């Protein structure tokens, strides 16, 4: 292909992909045309989209174990074909075919067979593109459930100007005088209240 990448005008202005992943496709051009494969992954790049198929465009990959010289291992790997180099196989004659975005009932858009009668039994089903659910594997420690996280705890009914909500505790009344349920005893222990108390006790004794 062209080696510039940024000179290419970005294609796929409306995001619609006729080839999906996990489907039988026909390779149209290249070192192996006439062969077929299953799409492993589609690289959806607007400028240079690629498609990796099952065991067809095989080239040896030199995986470099980090080293200065010739220490490396070699693994055969499916090289990415261009998205334009592949076409879907129809299940009837084994030849490549054009997928169209027909609209069925209920407003949904499906992938039909490019026929003048595009209806049921011509729709090519598209599999979902996401399955990363952390919902399984939840309920670990340091986590909270969605129903607990959606409590309506906040209300503006309280919080009105309450300068005298002190309750008279040495500095636990300072915070609700500056506008507060309970300060920790350790926090009040940090500001020591016993420097004058020891001098008072020693003077008393």
């Amino acid at each position: 292909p062209q080696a510039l990448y940024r000179s290419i005008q970005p294609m796929f202005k409306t995001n619609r992909w006729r080839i999906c992943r996990d489907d039988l496709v026909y390779i149209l051009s290249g070192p192996d045309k006439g062969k077929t494969g299953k799409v492993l992954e589609i690289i959806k790049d607007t400028r240079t989209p690629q498609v990796i198929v099952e065991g067809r465009n095989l080239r040896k990959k030199k995986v470099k174990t980090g080293t200065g010289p010739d220490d490396f291992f070699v693994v055969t790997m499916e090289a990415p074909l261009h998205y334009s180099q592949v076409q879907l196989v129809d299940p009837q004659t084994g030849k490549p075919m054009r997928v169209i975005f027909a609209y069925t009932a209920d407003g949904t858009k499906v992938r039909s067979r490019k026929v003048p009668n595009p209806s049921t039994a011509d729709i090519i089903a598209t599999p979902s593109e996401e399955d990363p659910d952390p919902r399984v594997g939840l309920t670990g420690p340091k986590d909270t459930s969605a129903s607990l996280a959606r409590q309506a705890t906040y209300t503006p009914s309280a919080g009105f100007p309450f300068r005298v909500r002190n309750l008279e505790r040495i500095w636990a009344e300072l915070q609700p005088d500056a506008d507060x349920x309970x300060x920790x005893x350790x926090x009040x222990x940090x500001x020591x209240x016993x420097x004058x108390x020891x001098x008072x006790x020693x003077x008393x004794x």
Binding site: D133, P134, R135, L138, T139, K142, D143, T144, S145, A146, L148, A149, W171, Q175, X181, X182, X183, X184, X186, X187, X190, X191
Partner: protein
Amino acid sequence: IGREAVVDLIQQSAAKQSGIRKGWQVKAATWVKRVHVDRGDVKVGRLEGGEFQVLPHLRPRYFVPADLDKFQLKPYVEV
């Protein structure tokens, strides 16, 4: 032409090229070991006879809640 307008334009120009201190800022970062630059601390007192006196109302107080143990909200929400 005013003094504040020039400083504000300098700061707007310095808004660009910001982040993790690249380039000339690597050398300029060493001004803190050359001219006694005061950091972003809050002062807690004043010198009267050369002995510092911390004012007790400016000592740091942290209003920590009563119990953060068995409190029913964790830092993470389940997906």
